[PDB]
């Protein structure tokens, strides 16, 4: 059993509930965590 057009599955309305909460905020739970995590890595230890 399958639907017709765009897009499935899915799943209107899940363009802003499934593909933005664990997809765009993934670029936040690791990308923004890198902002504070890297502030003590770039100097350890390229400058010995």
Partner 1 sequence: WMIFDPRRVFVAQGVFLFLLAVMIHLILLSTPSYNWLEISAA
Partner 2 sequence: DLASLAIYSFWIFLAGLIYYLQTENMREGYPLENEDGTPAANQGPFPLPKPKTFILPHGRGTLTVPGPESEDRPIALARTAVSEGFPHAPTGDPMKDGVGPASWVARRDLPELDGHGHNKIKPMKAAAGFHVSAGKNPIGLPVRGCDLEIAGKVVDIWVDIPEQMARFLEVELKDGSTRLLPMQMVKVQSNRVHVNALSSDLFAGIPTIKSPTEVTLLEEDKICGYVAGGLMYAAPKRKSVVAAMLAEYA
Partner 3 sequence: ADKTIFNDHLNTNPKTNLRLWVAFQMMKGAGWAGGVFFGTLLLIGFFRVVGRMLPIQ
Q: Residue positions in the annotated binding site for a bacteriochlorophyll?
A: 20, 38
Cα–Cα distance, 28 to 13 (Å, whole number): 23
User: From its own copies, partner 1, ligand BCL, none, which one binds at residue 26 (CB under 5 to 8 Å depending on kind)?
Assistant: partner 1
* 32 lies in the site for ligand BCL, by CB under 6 A: no
DSSP structural state of residue 38: G
Nearest distance from C-beta of residue 17 to its own copies, angstroms? 5
CA torsion, points 17, 22, 27, 31, in degrees to nearest 10?
A: 140
The encoded tokens of residue 47 equal 């400058």
Residues 8-27 that bind its own copies (CB under 8 A): 9, 11, 13-14, 17-18, 21-22
């Amino acid at each position: 059993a399958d639907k017709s057009d765009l897009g499935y599955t899915g799943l209107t309305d899940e363009q802003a509930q499934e593909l933005h909460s664990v997809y765009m905020s993934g670029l936040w739970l690791f990308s923004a965590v890198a902002i504070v995590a890297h502030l003590a890595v770039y100097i350890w230890r390229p400058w010995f």
